[model samples]
Target: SYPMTPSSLVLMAGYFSGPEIGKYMPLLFQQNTSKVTFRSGSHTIKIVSMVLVDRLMWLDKHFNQYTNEPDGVFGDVGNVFVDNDNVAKVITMSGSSAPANRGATLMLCRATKNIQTFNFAATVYIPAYKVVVLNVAQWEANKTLTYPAIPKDTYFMVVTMGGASFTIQRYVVYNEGLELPAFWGKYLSQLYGFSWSSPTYACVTWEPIYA
Candidate 1:
């Protein structure tokens, strides 16, 4: 059995059950319906699975218990590990500015569960849409990249955009029954007041178990 990263360890936990799957259904619906159109003057009917929203609210409440800590920004209460690849990068300011908004960027990597030695990297682009205000325009543009093979178990990555700044985080599992490591990327606006939203895009990569 290969050593797993903390981030991957958390994902392998049994917390994810059938009910948990329902929590993320809303995102799937949004992704599938974002481009769909209804006929003019025709009543469009859609059956929304409320289970997702219900589970999300539950998870939010469950995780809310850990929001007090520095890494608890995401409401993860399990004391999971977070990545810290780009914690010191800061956004430049234009003129004399208060300490209210300062832009920054962060990246995190974690190993997955299972016996394989697979690992994953999650790069978050926060305030990625507000590149214009930071003297960096058109940051929301689509981009992609590839890396070397990783041997781990499971990988979970997330990017959150807030009103003042943007945050990126991920979890990696290192051992069979250990906790996963979480990484975060935060960007603060130095000049203008900015609001962060969910990352426009996110992706994950992992090694196959059977070769």
Candidate 2:
């Protein structure tokens, strides 16, 4: 339903039968095998969902979206945050750059839905092999579990937020396309069940996980 043809992996924030109990059904998040498939006569298309949990696997490098750099530096260089915390700290760019305390690219505001609030954004940017990881720069749970934005067949890891001081729970998000801007980390922190009010990242696990 995301305006996709028979060829590309999409922003798929899908799947809601239930959270994976064990290693998942091999159709959900179990690395290479997990995916949503489509076929027609001579043409067959497979959209990948997740990847194995090695940090530098082929799948990892291929889909490396959010990286500090290719060498893994703090890729926070181009990232601009408008929070009061973004404060007066001056960040130096290698070439040309802006001044201290740049203007807001996106506004951070709060909007509540479902008569409830969640722990993360209902819509996230993910590759077919990697998941979405919001940059919170706060709390161990969120920052530790956060994945870099790898590039590839992107999908939308859409799910509302969970709760405060987030505890790992059965969170279900659809795997499809939801064209969200990567720079809009502000929107994540503003919404109630969006991303900020929640743990600021995926509450799932690296549970000895991989492709």
Candidate 3:
């Protein structure tokens, strides 16, 4: 592996969080740099933010301060890395002298409450390395700057990607066990990762469950 020069490092992209500063040093800064240096060969890598780096450094120094044993995740980035699509992958460190270093770690977060969902199904041809951010506020406004207020209590929305080439039948089950979809329309997505499937929008309906 070639030695990485600090001069060659270019920030490709990054995501930051607020409310994590106190000691005049920023607590978090997720840096997605252009290249990486690893043990064998390197592709590209991302550096974990300040908070995680501090934790990993402390762990390595405090326990095995005198030993040459590598205790935590390797590489200068500490415990996390990113993919070609800018997706973050975390590497959790096993105990210092565990019998074997395992490959999996379980991370959990509390689920959010009161979420409403909309499913837009479509057949589209996306580019090889395409990235798109679909906003519900923009969709409901018909591609205008002025949009309605986003759902206040919503946690997350799922976008169905890499769908079937052909559109299939959609169904809704009624109270009496009747099966039929109220709205079924077809729309093709050829634009920059947008389906324009608003025409086929199944209107929002209130259910007794939320009451």
The per-residue C-alpha lDDT of model 3 at residue 126 equals 19
Clashes of 1: 48
Scored by lDDT, model 2 comes in at: 0.19
Encode model 2's per-residue lDDT on 1-211: one tens digit a residue. 1222212211111121112221222212211221222211232222222222222211121232332212121111121111112111111111101221111111101111111111121112221111453322211121111123323212112122211111112211112222222322332221112222122222111111122
lDDT of each: 0.19, 0.19, 0.17
Q: Which candidate number maximizes TM-score?
A: 1
Encode model 3's per-residue lDDT on 29-50: one tens digit a residue. Answer: 2222321111112322222111
lDDT of 1 by residue, 41-95 (tens): 2212111110100111111111222112122112221211212221111111111
lDDT score for residue 79 of model 3: 18
Off by over 4 Å in 2: 1-15, 22-30, 34-36, 49-211
- Taking all chains together, each candidate's TM-score versus the true structure is 0.19, 0.16, 0.16
What RMSD does each model have against the real structure? Answer: 20.0, 21.3, 22.5
Q: After superposition, how far is residue 163 of candidate 2 from its true place, in Å?
A: 33
